[PDB]
């Protein structure tokens, strides 16, 4: 062990889970999160699914003012969006820089993991009870088991979506799962996770009470495609659209189309534009787009190392985010009309 | 919760099998041997050439047994011109799905005995190593390697988890030189940014010796370094994919390493000892930042579907190039690397 400097003592999931406990409002809200999301990947619900929220959550109370909004939005728009929070907690870099909230809530190089697995509880519970589901990147195989009852849906990123590890945890994760494409734009390798994902697996895991056993999964069939460019170039238009379907085996999902990462180009302000060319897709009759993901916060742009700016990805801001969202329901209800 | 969860499963502590299956002295001063051979070769203070060959995956520890006689027998011949390191891969990752090696299903007919896959891994790890053949194996499973480590001299993260944030970290935390394979499309900058976040010391959650979970800290791994293996953008172990590949490294970078299987042998493994021609080229003629090759080599060539029903000593995962091919590869590599010497001088 040369290259270990030491172990801290870390929380079990079980115990967070008594020291942080879920309100009854919280687990509805999971819950029905989870059915919604359900009903529209697999085509029972003509609605839209909007995974839509910050890059990242750094600041907690900040976090809270943005769902109060985003609620109140959702409440507005549902009979045409089914929405769900990002609430990311893990944040996979290019090389090396802040993780996220579990990793390093101080965002100072200290690394109180304990106590960012409390913040991440106490946010998710936060959320969850006003009535907002949330989702997160599931990049940790660790990390679910202290906060997977909060969840209605986890992504796998475009880094992972061909790690076996990701295929298995999402396999036995009670949620849906969108595999984000690879980092050079293309789609197979996401499909071929969908698969995977859908097969029981065995693999060595951690059980709530943090000791390690073998795990037997399910295997997970609300696993589905997310679209997020890549080296190749953008993929959210009708032709990318079209050779993706052609590539869907049987029994597949809906697709999803992330609007920022490389469908934005390196520029937040793309979002916007994605999304009227998503929506002019779906109002002319495309059935096989089924979700949507937005960088979105209370602020736009973003910072290095001001109250609701990203810290990480640049996000388009509350006002941007209205008029996306009020577009993209108005593309759903012309959608209903057309498969009339 | 745990609705997709069908049940836990007890498994043994890493310390436990550590006790019950312990490494001779033979076996732990061979697996040290084994890392400082390496790093003396990546970083530059040898002139022999690191080689990483045998078979794809091992399902068979006797079979196994035989394949590491050979070839401690031509690594003695060899040892002037190449230091080797036999592949004893125990985790394979799948396209989709199918078997995923000794560990996951040892008796490779989906009953998943993931302790005796643990036993029979730690089991051959102590023979390979007992005879002083220092071994290698892809670390894919974050867990596993608590099990294991104390036995192995090269760890490689492979293509499809090169970018992964976990296996970054895993890698930080290993003691010993560890190779981050380009990624699937043919793309080097992934592995270089992989080796770079690597050497950084990282905190994560992570299984102890005695199986329970804890935060870890790590120190970071200045012996990481890039293996080509081609993709689809087509192969990449030629001169001027090499002259690429050295114009991105950055300060510090150790040498390279050149996969003759995978993407650079093209859906065939009669192509590897045509890299090999093409490699030896390079280095005789005083390439000095190929400081490394690997070899998908097993007893007899080619592959085999899973029908107990198996023949011997041939591979249920990928193609290899039988055991003369090898010998010969070798034989052709060592010759190489003396050449290149003479144009050092
Ligand atoms: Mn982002
Ligand atoms: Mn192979």
């Given at each position: 062990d040369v290259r270990i400097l030491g172990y801290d003592p870390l929380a079990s999931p079980a115990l967070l889970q008594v020291q942080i406990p879920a309100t009854p409002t919280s687990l509805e809200t999971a819950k029905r999160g989870r059915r919604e999301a359900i009903d529209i990947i697999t085509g029972k619900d003509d609605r839209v699914l909007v995974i839509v929220?910050?890059?990242?959550?750094?600041d907690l109370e900040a976090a809270q003012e943005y769902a109060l909004r985003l609620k109140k939005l959702s409440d507005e728009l549902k009979g045409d969006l089914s929405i769900i929070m990002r609430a990311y907690l893990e944040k996979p870099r290019t090389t090396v820089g802040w993780k996220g909230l579990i990793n390093d809530?101080?965002?100072?190089?200290?690394?109180?993991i304990n106590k960012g697995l409390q913040s991440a509880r106490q946010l998710f519970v936060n959320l969850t009870n006003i009535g907002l589901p949330i989702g997160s990147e599931?990049?940790?195989?660790?990390?679910p088991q202290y906060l997977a009852d909060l969840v209605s849906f986890g992504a796998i990123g475009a880094r992972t979506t061909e790690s076996q590890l990701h295929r298995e945890l999402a396999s036995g994760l009670s949620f849906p799962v969108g595999f984000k494409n690879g980092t050079d734009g293309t789609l197979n390798v996401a499909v071929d996770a969908c698969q995977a994902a859908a097969h029981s697996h065995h693999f060595m895991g951690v059980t709530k009470h943090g000791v390690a056993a073998i795990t037997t999964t399910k295997g997970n069939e609300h696993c589905f495609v997310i679209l997020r460019g890549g080296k190749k170039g953008t993929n959210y238009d009708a032709k990318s659209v079209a050779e993706a379907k052609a590539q869907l085996p049987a029994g597949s999902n809906g697709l999803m189309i992330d609007y920022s990462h490389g469908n934005s180009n390196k520029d937040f302000r793309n979002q916007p534009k994605v999304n009227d060319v998503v929506c002019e897709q779906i109002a002319n009759?495309?059935?096989?787009?089924?979700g949507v993901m937005i960088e979105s916060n209370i602020n736009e742009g973003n910072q290095g190392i001001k109250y609701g700016v990203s810290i990480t990805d640049a996000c388009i801001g509350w006002e941007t985010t209205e008029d996306v969202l009020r577009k993209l329901a108005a593309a759903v209800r012309q959608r209903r009309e057309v498969n009339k």
């Open positions: 929220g910050p890059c990242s959550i750094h809530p101080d965002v100072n190089n200290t690394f109180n599931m990049l940790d195989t660790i990390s009759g495309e059935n096989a787009i089924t």
